[PDB]
From a paper:
Toho-1 β-lactamase, also classified as CTX-M-44, is a class A ESBL. Like most other class A β-lactamases, it comprises two highly conserved domains (α/β and α), with the active site located at the interface of these two domains. After substrate binding, Ser 70 attacks the carbonyl carbon of the β-lactam ring to form an acyl-enzyme intermediate, which is then deacylated to liberate the inactivated antibiotic. Glu 166 plays a vital role in the deacylation step (stages 3 to 5), where it acts as the activating base of a hydrolytic water molecule.
To characterize β-lactam hydrolysis in a class A β-lactamase, we determined both neutron and high-resolution 15 K X-ray acyl-intermediate structures of the Toho-1 Glu 166 Ala/Arg 274 Asn/Arg 276 Asn mutant in complex with the monobactam antibiotic aztreonam, which is often used to treat bacterial lung infections in patients with cystic fibrosis. The aztreonam acyl intermediate was trapped for combined neutron and X-ray structure determination by mutating Glu 166 to Ala. In the 15 K X-ray structure, the average atomic displacement parameter (ADP) or B factor for protein main chain atoms is 7.68 Å2, with an average of 12.92 Å2 for protein side chain atoms. However, at around 5 Å2, the values for the main-chain and side-chain ADPs of atoms in the three active site key residues, Lys 73, Ser 130, and Lys 234, are considerably lower than the average. Thus, we observed clear omit electron density for almost all of the deuterium atoms within the active site. The omit electron density for the side chain of Lys 234 confirms that it is in the ND3+ cationic form and reveals the positions of all three deuterium atoms. It forms hydrogen bonds with Oγ of Ser 130 (2.84 Å), the main-chain carbonyl oxygen of Thr 235 (2.83 Å), and a nearby water molecule (2.73 Å). The omit electron density around the β-lactam ring nitrogen of aztreonam clearly indicates that it is protonated, with the deuterium orientated toward Oγ of Ser 130, with which it forms a hydrogen bond (2.84 Å). The omit electron density for Dγ of Ser 130 indicates that it is orientated toward Nζ of Lys 73, with which it forms a hydrogen bond (2.72 Å). The main chain carbonyl of Ser 237 hydrogen bonds to an amide group of the monobactam (2.77 Å), while one of the dual conformations of the side chain of Ser 237 interacts with a carboxylate group on the monobactam (2.70 Å).
Residue numbers in the entry: 27 to 57, 59 to 238, 240 to 252, 254 to 290
Write the structure that this text describes.
C-alpha cells in the first residue's frame, strides 16, 4: 500500500481523526493527511508562546533573564517545575524551558501574561505568515479540545510550515532559533510519541500535547544521520470526551511517513 493508503488504514483502525503533515526539507516535498483540517493544538501551542518571547528578546538583551514571581495562586492542573519555585522567581528563559521541556502549564501562562494575552500569541503567529493558528485561552482550558470548537486550533500543514520556519528557517534570528531548537531537543515528554516511531539514534526536538476527547498531539523536527531534516506534525482526536490519549497512534504515523528516510 502507498503511504496515503497506510495513513488512511491507520485512521480507520484508530477510532478517531488523524492529521499528518510531513515536510521533507531535502526537496520540499510533503506528505499530507487531513492537513488542512483544524485540530485543537493543546499544549503544542506552547511552542508559539515561547517563540514569541524569543522574538521579543532579539531587541531586548535583558528579557530572557527578567525575573518573574511565582505564587501559589499561579499553580494550575500540571506544573511540575513552577511548583518548585513558589515564593521565588523564575526567569523568562527558565519559563520557556519549563513550558517546552516539561509542559509546565503555569510556565505557559506566565509566557502568555508577559506577552499580553492569548491574542498576542496569535499576532506573533500571523507575523510569521501563519494565517491559521489561533490561541484563545490560557492553560489548562486551552486543552478542552471539543470537536468542532475553533478555539486554540490550527491545521497540521500550517503548524508544520511554521515549525519549519521557527526551527530551521526565517522566523527567528540565529541565537533565538538555536535556543528554540535546544529547548525542543531537550523535551522530556515525548518518548512514546513521534520519537517511538523513529530510529533510536535520530536526533529529535518535539513538543507534545494531550487534552480531552483523547486529543493526542506531537510536533517535531527530526534530524536523520545521513539526510536533511524532516518536520512532522501528528495530531489525533477522538469523538468521546473521556477517550484515552493514544500516543501509540502518533508513533505509528511517524513510522509510516519516515519509512525510507
Ligand atoms: C497540554 O497539552 C497539557 N494538557 C493538559 O493540561 C491536560 N492534561 O494534561 C495531562 C498531562 C494532565 C494529562 O493527564 O493528559 C488537559 C486535559 S483536559 C484539559 N483541559 N487539560 C499537557 C500538560 N501537556 S503535555 O505535553 O504533557 O501533554
Amino acid at each position: 500500500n502507498s503511504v496515503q493508503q497506510q495513513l488512511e488504514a491507520l485512521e480507520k483502525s484508530s477510532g478517531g481523526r488523524l492529521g499528518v503533515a510531513l515536510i521533507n526539507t531535502a526537496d520540499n516535498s510533503q506528505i499530507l493527511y487531513r492537513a488542512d483540517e483544524r485540530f485543537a493544538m493543546c499544549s503544542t501551542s506552547k511552542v508559539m508562546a515561547a517563540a514569541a518571547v524569543l522574538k521579543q528578546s532579539e531587541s531586548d538583551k535583558h528579557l530572557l533573564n527578567q525575573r518573574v514571581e511565582i505564587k501559589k495562586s499561579d499553580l494550575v492542573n500540571y506544573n511540575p517545575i513552577a511548583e518548585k519555585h513558589v515564593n521565588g522567581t523564575m526567569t523568562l528563559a527558565e519559563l520557556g524551558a519549563a513550558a517546552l521541556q516539561y509542559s509546565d502549564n503555569t510556565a505557559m501562562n506566565k509566557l502568555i501574561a508577559h506577552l499580553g494575552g492569548p491574542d498576542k500569541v496569535t499576532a506573533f503567529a500571523r507575523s510569521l505568515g501563519d494565517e491559521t493558528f489561533r490561541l484563545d485561552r490560557t492553560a489548562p482550558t486551552l486543552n478542552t479540545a471539543i470537536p468542532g470548537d475553533p478555539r486554540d486550533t490550527t491545521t497540521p500543514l500550517a503548524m508544520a510550515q511554521t515549525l519549519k520556519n521557527l526551527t530551521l528557517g526565517k522566523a527567528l534570528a540565529e541565537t533565538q532559533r538555536a535556543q528554540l531548537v535546544t529547548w525542543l531537543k531537550g523535551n522530556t515528554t515525548g518518548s512514546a510519541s513521534i520519537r517511538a516511531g523513529l530510529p533510536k539514534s535520530w536526533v529529535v526536538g518535539d513538543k507534545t500535547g494531550s487534552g480531552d476527547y483523547g486529543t493526542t498531539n506531537d510536533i517535531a523536527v527530526i534530524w536523520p544521520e545521513n539526510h536533511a531534516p524532516l518536520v512532522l506534525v501528528t495530531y489525533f482526536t477522538q469523538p468521546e470526551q473521556k477517550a484515552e490519549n493514544r500516543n501509540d497512534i502518533l508513533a505509528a504515523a511517524a513510522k509510516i511517513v519516515t519509512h525510507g528516510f
